[PDB]
Amino acid sequence: TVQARQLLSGIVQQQNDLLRAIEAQQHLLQLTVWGIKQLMEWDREINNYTSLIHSLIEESQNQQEKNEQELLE
Amino acid sequence: TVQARQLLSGIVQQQNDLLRAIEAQQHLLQLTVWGIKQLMEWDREINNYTSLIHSLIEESQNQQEKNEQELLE
Amino acid sequence: TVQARQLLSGIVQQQNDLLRAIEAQQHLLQLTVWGIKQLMEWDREINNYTSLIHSLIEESQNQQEKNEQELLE
From the DSSP assignment, how many helices (H) and strands (E) are in chain C?
2, 0
Q: What experimental approach yielded this model?
A: X-ray
User: Distance, in angstroms, between B28 CA and closest chain A CA?
Assistant: 6
Contact A29, B28 (CB under 8 A): yes
From the DSSP assignment, how many helices (H) and strands (E) are in chain A?
2, 0
Burial class (CB in 10 A: 0-12, 13-18, 19+), B42: middle
Find the farthest-apart pair of alpha carbons in chain A and give their distance in angstroms, rounded: 57
Q: What is the DSSP string of C30-54?
A: HHHHHHHHH--HHHHHHHHHHHHHH
- Domains within chain A, CATH numbers bracketed: 1-73 (1.10.287.210)
Contact C63, C18 (CB under 8 A): no
Chain B contact for A67 (CB, 8 A cutoff): yes
- Resolution of this model in Å is 2.0
Cα B11 to Cα B67: distance, rounded to the nearest angstrom: 10
| Closest to B14 in 3D by CA, of C51, A43, A28, A70 | A70
Cβ-defined contact of C63 to A13 (cutoff 8 Å)? yes
